[PDB]
Design an enzyme around this catalytic site. Structure first.
Site, PDB file in Angstrom:
ATOM      1  N   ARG A  35      19.042  44.443 -38.005  1.00 59.38           N
ATOM      2  CA  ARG A  35      20.123  44.196 -38.975  1.00 59.38           C
ATOM      3  C   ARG A  35      21.255  43.410 -38.340  1.00 59.38           C
ATOM      4  O   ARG A  35      22.353  43.928 -38.132  1.00 59.38           O
ATOM      5  CB  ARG A  35      20.681  45.507 -39.543  1.00 59.38           C
ATOM      6  CG  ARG A  35      19.663  46.429 -40.196  1.00 59.38           C
ATOM      7  CD  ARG A  35      19.266  45.979 -41.594  1.00 59.38           C
ATOM      8  NE  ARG A  35      17.972  46.537 -41.980  1.00 59.38           N
ATOM      9  CZ  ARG A  35      17.758  47.811 -42.294  1.00 59.38           C
ATOM     10  NH1 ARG A  35      18.749  48.698 -42.286  1.00 59.38           N
ATOM     11  NH2 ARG A  35      16.535  48.203 -42.624  1.00 59.38           N
ATOM     12  N   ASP A  43      11.764  34.661 -34.191  1.00 65.04           N
ATOM     13  CA  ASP A  43      11.878  35.496 -35.405  1.00 65.04           C
ATOM     14  C   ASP A  43      10.668  36.424 -35.613  1.00 65.04           C
ATOM     15  O   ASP A  43       9.666  36.308 -34.905  1.00 65.04           O
ATOM     16  CB  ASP A  43      12.107  34.615 -36.640  1.00 65.04           C
ATOM     17  CG  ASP A  43      13.475  33.938 -36.629  1.00 65.04           C
ATOM     18  OD1 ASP A  43      14.061  33.778 -35.536  1.00 65.04           O
ATOM     19  OD2 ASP A  43      13.963  33.560 -37.715  1.00 65.04           O
ATOM     20  N   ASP A  45      15.001  28.644 -39.997  1.00 64.92           N
ATOM     21  CA  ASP A  45      14.436  28.335 -41.324  1.00 64.92           C
ATOM     22  C   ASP A  45      15.465  28.125 -42.443  1.00 64.92           C
ATOM     23  O   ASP A  45      15.510  27.052 -43.049  1.00 64.92           O
ATOM     24  CB  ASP A  45      13.430  29.417 -41.749  1.00 64.92           C
ATOM     25  CG  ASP A  45      13.813  30.806 -41.263  1.00 64.92           C
ATOM     26  OD1 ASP A  45      14.889  31.308 -41.659  1.00 64.92           O
ATOM     27  OD2 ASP A  45      13.031  31.397 -40.488  1.00 64.92           O
ATOM     28  N   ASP A  61      20.784  28.502 -39.704  1.00 69.12           N
ATOM     29  CA  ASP A  61      20.095  28.594 -38.423  1.00 69.12           C
ATOM     30  C   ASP A  61      20.417  27.369 -37.558  1.00 69.12           C
ATOM     31  O   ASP A  61      20.552  27.501 -36.339  1.00 69.12           O
ATOM     32  CB  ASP A  61      18.582  28.727 -38.622  1.00 69.12           C
ATOM     33  CG  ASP A  61      18.199  29.953 -39.440  1.00 69.12           C
ATOM     34  OD1 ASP A  61      18.874  30.998 -39.339  1.00 69.12           O
ATOM     35  OD2 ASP A  61      17.201  29.869 -40.184  1.00 69.12           O
ATOM     36  N   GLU A  79       0.764  48.306 -52.147  1.00 70.34           N
ATOM     37  CA  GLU A  79      -0.303  48.483 -53.132  1.00 70.34           C
ATOM     38  C   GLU A  79      -1.285  47.296 -53.128  1.00 70.34           C
ATOM     39  O   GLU A  79      -2.448  47.455 -53.478  1.00 70.34           O
ATOM     40  CB  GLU A  79       0.320  48.658 -54.517  1.00 70.34           C
ATOM     41  CG  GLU A  79      -0.660  49.064 -55.600  1.00 70.34           C
ATOM     42  CD  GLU A  79       0.021  49.379 -56.917  1.00 70.34           C
ATOM     43  OE1 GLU A  79       0.848  48.564 -57.374  1.00 70.34           O
ATOM     44  OE2 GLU A  79      -0.268  50.449 -57.496  1.00 70.34           O
ATOM     45  N   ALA A 106       0.826  -1.208   0.000  1.00 65.48           N
ATOM     46  CA  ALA A 106       0.000   0.000   0.000  1.00 65.48           C
ATOM     47  C   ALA A 106       0.864   1.264   0.000  1.00 65.48           C
ATOM     48  O   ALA A 106       0.539   2.239  -0.684  1.00 65.48           O
ATOM     49  CB  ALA A 106      -0.952  -0.004   1.187  1.00 65.48           C
ATOM     50  N   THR A 137      15.250  40.361 -35.511  1.00 61.75           N
ATOM     51  CA  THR A 137      14.638  41.056 -36.649  1.00 61.75           C
ATOM     52  C   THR A 137      15.656  41.590 -37.645  1.00 61.75           C
ATOM     53  O   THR A 137      16.840  41.717 -37.337  1.00 61.75           O
ATOM     54  CB  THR A 137      13.736  42.225 -36.208  1.00 61.75           C
ATOM     55  OG1 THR A 137      13.295  42.962 -37.358  1.00 61.75           O
ATOM     56  CG2 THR A 137      14.468  43.171 -35.274  1.00 61.75           C
ATOM     57  N   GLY A 138      15.162  41.905 -38.843  1.00 65.25           N
ATOM     58  CA  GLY A 138      15.979  42.450 -39.933  1.00 65.25           C
ATOM     59  C   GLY A 138      15.820  43.945 -40.156  1.00 65.25           C
ATOM     60  O   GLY A 138      16.686  44.580 -40.751  1.00 65.25           O
ATOM     61  N   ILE A 183       4.091   1.617  -1.193  1.00 62.94           N
ATOM     62  CA  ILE A 183       4.707   1.764  -2.526  1.00 62.94           C
ATOM     63  C   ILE A 183       3.743   2.453  -3.494  1.00 62.94           C
ATOM     64  O   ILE A 183       2.672   1.922  -3.771  1.00 62.94           O
ATOM     65  CB  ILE A 183       5.087   0.402  -3.179  1.00 62.94           C
ATOM     66  CG1 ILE A 183       6.368  -0.170  -2.581  1.00 62.94           C
ATOM     67  CG2 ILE A 183       5.312   0.547  -4.685  1.00 62.94           C
ATOM     68  CD1 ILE A 183       6.175  -0.892  -1.277  1.00 62.94           C
ATOM     69  N   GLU A 236      -0.849   6.490   6.008  1.00 56.58           N
ATOM     70  CA  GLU A 236      -1.175   5.063   6.152  1.00 56.58           C
ATOM     71  C   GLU A 236      -0.197   4.289   7.018  1.00 56.58           C
ATOM     72  O   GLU A 236      -0.610   3.443   7.797  1.00 56.58           O
ATOM     73  CB  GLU A 236      -1.242   4.386   4.783  1.00 56.58           C
ATOM     74  CG  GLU A 236      -2.508   4.684   4.012  1.00 56.58           C
ATOM     75  CD  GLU A 236      -2.458   4.167   2.600  1.00 56.58           C
ATOM     76  OE1 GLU A 236      -1.975   3.031   2.393  1.00 56.58           O
ATOM     77  OE2 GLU A 236      -2.908   4.899   1.702  1.00 56.58           O
TER      78      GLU A 236
HETATM   79 CA   LIG Z   1       0.657   1.027  -3.074  1.00 57.79          CA
HETATM   80 CA   LIG Z   2      -3.220   5.386  -0.608  1.00 56.22          CA
END
Ligand SMILES: [Ca+2]
Ligand SMILES: [Ca+2]
Ligand SMILES: [Ca+2]
Ligand SMILES: [Ca+2]
Ligand code: NA
Ligand code: NA
Lengths: 994, 994
Positions: free
Chosen positions: B678, B351, B703, B707, B442, B305, B625-626, B307, B771
């Protein structure tokens, strides 16, 4: 309520708040049944000698075995090799199969106690008591009679419980207390207070005592004490627990069980000592302790299977159930041990009136002059069925029933046998029988006319109270009896001056109907009747009738022939003398013949079978009759005891000729007698003694007071129902019928249980014999041990359990009552049967390893096929250029194990069929005689099959399923238990018996 | 097919009877999958250190215990007293309850392997191969790619199996085999026979090798070998079995399991040594060996019990299932050990383009002059949902969607942003996304007009292929573009000379629509538009619009504001110069204002949450970042990394300023940076190194080829989907989305499993602690040991088994991502938690004997009531004038045993509720959060109840059913595990954290 003797008829009754002329309520009957138990002794422990050395011995086997399985189990966790599954499974199954045994064993036992309970509905009642339910006395089991109810007590009765004498009902009240106080003179009682409390039974002459006899009188009372509270019970308390009275079988079985404590332990401990050369093999890791644990399981688990179990309870199921069927057809046998004596009783000294004969007078045949031509005649006989005053009978012709109406003579025949009759029949509303109303020889003339039902009165829907006199009371309204010339030595006959009833004419149809003895009347018969006419009585005709009358009194019948006659034109009554018997010889001459009947005291129903059937079974029967030497013999030649023609004037006996002869003649003559006529009332004991001094076993019947002395002395004393209770105490069997036949229906049953016992074990022993040598044989030669502990447990559950149970549910063997008796000192196993025991084993064990060896050796459509040496199989890795394309490991596979263990189970099943009948063939006693066996078989087949064709299940027992082709080899090798055993029957049944 | 290098492009293909331009059949794919297994390494044995010392240790406990039960069992048959029933029952149940453990333990395990199987549906596919099913290349698991199929191989791809180069498809075919042959220079291959069979990888420059990288090119081929048949596999065979690479948790758990080999054996062996004064008591018959066997069971069965069992498989169920949910929302984590690192990764160097931002340009707001009165104006803004070129977006007003149609200005606004557009949108039938057709700034004008759907074209039932251009291609048919004045530095703007489409009139409705930058255009806007009219552009109005344009580029938004304009009455085209950009400043002055939009590169979906949520959980995030220093920062202030107003010019970085600083500044500055603008392609590694030298745990995304160096070095290297396979090899997690958020959805999950593990045991330990002390406490003072081995086994099946299993099926605690990270070297149990461990035990064990003691001592509505001394209870027969109307035997009854053992089971159940959340209340994480626990409870309740109210069943465990009145005491004494634990939460959550 103790010592109610100190208390009178008022202070007594009021104790239980109850009035003598009412009794106790059903609710009260409950409470006293609950608070005082029953009116009987305690339950004695049936702990046998087998229960100590075998039943519980097994109950040690199964546990130390299991213990061992958890020894090796525990070490598994410490094994460096491969984490196994099947070894891990084992202990689980170990426990889980042994529990299956308990599902069987205890269940057999419960049916055992259920059967005993079943008997408790037939146990004889001899206790009449006044109760609240009925406004009249009621029958009840002696044990069931609580203390308080107003016990009724008559001539000869046995007092079941301690009664305080409340109201004396006969003129005197005496009590034979020879059983306790001690004196063959009975004692006068009274109904009053015995003030001094401390005294002996003697000085309490105001109470009945439980177990004492009624010498005379009749009284009433109240029950002071019951069961152990009884006075004799306090004395009988000594005889209860402390004793040593085992029966002969009960000494065999256990001397038969304790010898197996030698066999079983011996053989199986040797099955360990023989495998000493296998305590360091690689299968066991070459470990010198891990092995010895396993060969502890082989022996023990073989032991378990070897031990026959369930016997104690099976014989209960068998014995009890047999006593049920004995009880059912009125063989009321209390003590169960009484069967073991009932089954070997080779003599039956029984009674005549009420036991061999019906007492009730009964007319056999009777005839009319069928044709008269040329002074010569043919006769017309008419046998009447039944044997009783109850009109439960029908006329015959060539054993073909026909209506007496079709013959005009019979229509006059009955007219004489209904009118010419100063007696009548009656029915009894309280009892339910037909009892005579007059003298029996004349009652038979009432009986007969009714049976014939000549003029065909509607009686099928007429009352019992009208039936007893349906025809007669119609005949009586067709004629008138004006005055009866009473029966007279002078003319050995009676007559009646009749006349047409409801008449107006004076001398026009009066008919002086005579009746009586042959010659006396026929010498006064000058005319003969045929149909409705007349013709002079002739010489050769007369001689035909009288020769045929000579015939019946000559033949084994010995029917009292009684001639009947008619005077056509009677003379004037005014003229006739009415008051001088000697005038009647002139008043009865010149008659017209009508007929002459043959009547007798017939035998009791189904005795004529129960006389020949027992002579076959080696039973020497004797009648204890009252008739005179001559006439007693005629009754014993009428039945079958004597044969028509066979001189026996050396064998018949009467008291005169019995007390004369010297002691040795009285012994020497007694081992060869059949009939004891006019036998003095003390002779019965002296007979027994003599018959016993010939090692012969008695079966005395009894009824009146002075029978107990013989009955107590004899082995199975019997009693009559109408016989008193003094005799039902001194007996071992109570004929609830009175009949000789019902004793036979008892010996024949009590024997049947003996034959079922001798099979129930014959199966076990023989079958389990082979099982152990099944390890010896192979271990002797070198063959593989094609088994494992679980498989050895499997054989025990499958074979020993349920089919065994079905062997105790067997019908009667064909040859139940042809074979001679067992003399009680003859042991439980006979030499030829002992061979038959080991013979059957010899083979059912040899088939088992056979089937295993057939696989390795001469296989069909299978792998391996090594018909050469399999002995030194452990040198296969030593020398490997011998095999041809197969591994040395092949022999550890489950394939042969399957076959053999399958043959081990298969063959023992049909071994039960063999065991169905001790000596009668499968053609003679087919397997379907016992449905309870044919069930037991299929069941285990389902089970055994089930553990081959369910993936994990075979893997558990280390087996493999088999192709159709393989379950055929099982038949060719298992069936031979039939042919083998069946040959055994042919030797015993023909050469050793018959 | 081995060494296919010796063989050319013909003798190769034909081997498997298959033509390159077709491949293999599905039936064949079966056979090779069956005959060559999978294209992977063998299954390594996960045998733990706990599995040796605890799991199997129990597997010894349960057996020696059982063994002992058959020791005492066996001696029972040799006992002179009374034939018992309950002792006889014991070993049966022993076995029958331990089997119940196996119904549990193995079942938990099967769900474990079922869960792992479940993951095998998400394992990342990187293998394009030609097959017979589809007439085109198919995706498939690398392992699942059998040897034979025509493996396709492109730029950067990872060769999953050994491919013979059949057909070179790029102009060159080079292969980076630095992983094996060793050189940072790739190698030219060819498609021809290498005649000499014995050679090194180098000299086989005509084949791909499993595990090598594609430096450039694209080819096709055929698979020679797979799995162990691989060349690197033969080298990797060394690294397979023989190793020692346990993770930190995997070292804790087992140093945590092996310490319990001390605790368990110690305490329980001591539970034997403490009962040395009970080895000759009359309960054990005063036998000095029969006792020691029993107190062998007390310790051991208490051990069992004690264990904790099922952990190895539960963490499998937990871990795996968590990796499922990680996989489900695109967190593709291969190695399961990667979670243990995934859960403590306190830094996220991720990134920007594709990970923090959608790349896809997107218009944010845009406004029309709503009212103009008194030279002053109110503006009308319109935020657009989404962030993508997919028209999956809708206009707003105060965060309330409305139809742009309701505003006439917007109907001109889009007309300019649909016409004045030299670019378009497109849908991709092969991919399924909307990809731009022009320049993004655009493209956003295509996007927007579509979203608005001004004139309300029916698009709900129009095709994807028409939707991408549904509105635009309608706008285009209302107007005409006659010639485009291209975008010009001069005027920072573009324009289009439009005109009414399908026209007949010449100079009647032409509209010179301009577009572009704010000032440049607004300085040429002399009129303002409102609705469908005009009014002179005013001072304060201009300043309102331009101040609001100043607003968006000032605020954290930083929306590229782009002004749009209209010339009403255009001049004559004949007159207009068409070929000199510098004429357009005279051709674009005097415009009518229409609007000015704000557009930007938005953040990736659910990052704005995944940025604040992680800062809470103690996570230091960094962008690689670039963008330029300035503009990179604007993106990191747009999201949340930086705040609107919070000086950070000490924390932003660009490559210039990075390689300058001295090594220590490069370290010192790095433990405090957020943005790497940069940044040269080698910087990434140097960062990692520095960040690591601060004990901090990295989460690099990647990527492109360069890397892997960083990713391999970091703890959880991540990869992009569209990123090549060279990177999905060098990584630990593959973002199947690319998003920063999906990494968070991974850390947050990988953490959850850590919290569920720390509870699954918290329940076991704490509960099982009590117990054992439950025997110490009572044995210390003298109290009765209100238990028996079976009852000690009962507690193990009920409590440790199923509710335990449900603790691993738990949702996320409220405080999943506010609490700081676990530094990987911090042990499995902390001091306060260690107290909390023994504290909870302290009580759940003290409640148990309490309830037992409450019965004997201060009972309510019960028999006995002995509040005085119960210590020297064994002297009750010595001195009997102390008790008041009760036997000394009373304490061997099952009544207190029932209660305590019932309280032992009752209280540990709600202890799991406690364990639902490590720190959040039953109000905060009620019992119904986990249905799988609320099931586990009732179940065991049925079971535990069941063994009280079923006649023989309680008799087995030596218990008794309880009245309603008694099952109330269970609540008052069991509930306190709630209030107790709940108080623990209040201390940790507030005083120890927060
Ligand atoms: Ca046990
Ligand atoms: Ca128990
Ligand atoms: Ca047996
Ligand atoms: Ca058998
Ligand atoms: Na007798
Ligand atoms: Na890494």
């Amino acid at each position: 309520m103790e010592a109610a003797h100190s208390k009178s008829t008022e202070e007594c009754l009021a104790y239980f708040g109850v009035s003598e002329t009412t009794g106790l309520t059903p609710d009260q009957v409950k409470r006293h049944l609950e608070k005082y138990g029953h009116n009987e002794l305690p339950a004695e422990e049936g702990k046998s000698l087998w229960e100590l050395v075998i039943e519980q011995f097994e109950d040690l086997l199964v546990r130390i075995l299991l213990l061992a399985a958890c020894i090796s189990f525990v070490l598994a966790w410490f094994e460096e090799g491969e984490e196994t599954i099947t070894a891990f499974v084992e202990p689980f199954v170990i426990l889980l199969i042994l529990i299956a045994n308990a599902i069987v064993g205890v269940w057999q036992e419960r049916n055992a106690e259920n059967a005993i309970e079943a008997l408790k509905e037939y146990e004889p009642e001899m206790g009449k008591v006044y109760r609240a339910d009925r406004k009249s006395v009621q029958r009840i089991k002696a044990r069931d009679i609580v203390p308080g109810d107003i016990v009724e007590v008559a001539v000869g009765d046995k007092v079941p419980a301690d009664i305080r004498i409340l109201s004396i009902k006969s003129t005197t009240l005496r009590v034979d207390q020879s059983i306790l106080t001690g004196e063959s003179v009975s004692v006068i009682k009274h109904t009053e207070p015995v003030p001094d409390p401390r005294a002996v039974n003697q000085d309490k002459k105001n109470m009945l005592f439980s177990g004492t006899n009624i010498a005379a009188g009749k009284a009433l009372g109240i029950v002071a004490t019951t069961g152990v509270s009884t006075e004799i019970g306090k004395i009988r308390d000594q005889m209860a627990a402390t004793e040593q009275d085992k029966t002969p079988l009960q000494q065999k079985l256990d001397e038969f069980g304790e010898q197996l404590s030698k066999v079983i332990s011996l053989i199986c401990v040797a099955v360990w000592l023989i495998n000493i050369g296998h305590f360091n093999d690689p299968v066991h890791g070459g470990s010198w302790i891990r092995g010895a644990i396993y060969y502890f399981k082989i022996a023990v688990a073989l032991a378990v299977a070897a031990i026959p179990e369930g016997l104690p309870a099976v014989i209960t199921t068998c014995l009890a159930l047999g006593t049920r069927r004995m009880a059912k057809k009125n063989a009321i046998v209390r003590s169960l041990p009484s069967v073991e004596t009932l089954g070997c009783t080779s003599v039956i000294c029984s009674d005549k009136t009420g036991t061999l004969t019906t007492n009730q007078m009964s007319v056999c045949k009777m005839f009319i002059i069928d044709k008269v031509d040329g002074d010569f005649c043919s006769l017309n006989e008419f046998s009447i069925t039944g044997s009783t005053y109850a009109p439960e009978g029908e006329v015959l012709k060539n054993d073909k029933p026909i209506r007496s109406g079709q013959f005009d003579g019979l229509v006059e025949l009955a007219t004489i046998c209904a009118l010419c009759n100063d007696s009548s029949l009656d029915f009894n509303e309280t009892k339910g029988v037909y009892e005579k109303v007059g003298e029996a020889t004349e009652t038979a003339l009432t009986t007969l006319v009714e049976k014939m039902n000549v003029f065909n009165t509607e009686v099928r829907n007429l009352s019992k109270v009208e039936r007893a006199n349906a025809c007669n009371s119609v005949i009586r309204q067709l004629m008138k009896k004006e005055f009866t010339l009473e029966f007279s030595r002078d003319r050995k006959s009676m007559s009646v001056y009749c006349s047409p009833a409801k008449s107006s004419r004076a001398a026009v149809g009066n008919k002086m109907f005579v009746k009586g003895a042959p010659e006396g009347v026929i010498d006064r018969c000058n005319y003969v009747r045929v149909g409705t006419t007349r013709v002079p009585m002739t010489g050769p005709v007369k001689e035909k009738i009288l020769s045929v009358i000579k015939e019946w009194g000559t033949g084994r019948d010995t029917l009292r022939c009684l001639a009947l006659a008619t005077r056509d034109t009677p003379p004037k009554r005014e003229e006739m003398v009415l008051d001088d018997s000697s005038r009647f010889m002139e008043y009865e001459t010149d008659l017209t013949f009508v007929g002459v009947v043959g009547m007798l005291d017939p035998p009791r129903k189904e005795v004529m079978g129960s006389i020949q059937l027992c002579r076959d079974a080696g039973i020497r029967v004797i009648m204890i009759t009252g008739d005179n030497k001559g006439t007693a013999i005629a009754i014993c030649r009428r039945i079958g005891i004597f044969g028509e023609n066979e001189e026996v004037a050396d064998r018949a006996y009467t008291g005169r000729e019995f007390d004369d002869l010297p002691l040795a003649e009285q012994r020497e003559a007694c081992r060869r007698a059949c009939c004891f006529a006019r036998v003095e009332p003390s002779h019965k004991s002296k007979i027994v003694e003599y018959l016993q001094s010939y090692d012969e076993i008695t079966a005395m019947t009894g009824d009146g007071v002075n029978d107990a002395p013989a009955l107590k002395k004899a082995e199975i004393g019997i009693a009559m129902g109408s016989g008193t209770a003094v005799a039902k105490t001194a007996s071992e069997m109570v004929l609830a019928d009175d009949n000789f036949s019902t004793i036979v229906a008892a010996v024949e049953e009590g024997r049947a249980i003996y034959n079922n016992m001798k099979q129930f074990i014959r199966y076990l022993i023989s079958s389990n014999v082979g099982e152990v040598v099944c390890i010896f044989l192979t271990a002797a030669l070198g063959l593989p041990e094609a088994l494992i502990p679980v498989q050895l447990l499997w054989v025990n559950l499958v074979t020993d359990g349920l089919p065994a149970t079905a062997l105790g549910f067997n019908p009667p063997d064909l040859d139940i009552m042809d074979r001679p008796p067992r003399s009680p000192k003859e042991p439980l196993i006979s030499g030829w049967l002992f061979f038959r025991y080991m013979a059957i084993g010899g083979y059912v064990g040899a088939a088992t390893v056979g089937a295993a060896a057939w696989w390795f050796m001469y296989a069909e459509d299978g792998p391996g096929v090594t018909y050469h040496q399999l002995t030194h199989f452990m040198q296969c890795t030593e020398d490997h250029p011998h095999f041809e394309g197969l591994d040395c490991e092949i022999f550890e596979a489950p394939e042969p194990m399957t076959m053999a263990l399958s043959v081990l189970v298969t063959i023992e099943m049909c071994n039960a069929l063999n065991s169905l009948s001790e000596n009668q063939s499968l053609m003679r006693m087919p397997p379907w005689v016992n449905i309870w066996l044919l069930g037991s078989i299929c069941l285990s087949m389902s089970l055994h099959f089930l553990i081959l064709y369910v993936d994990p299940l075979p893997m558990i027992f280390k087996l493999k399923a088999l192709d159709l082709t393989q379950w055929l080899m099982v038949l060719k090798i298992s069936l031979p238990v039939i042919g083998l055993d069946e040959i055994l029957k042919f030797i015993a049944r023909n050469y050793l018996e018959g």
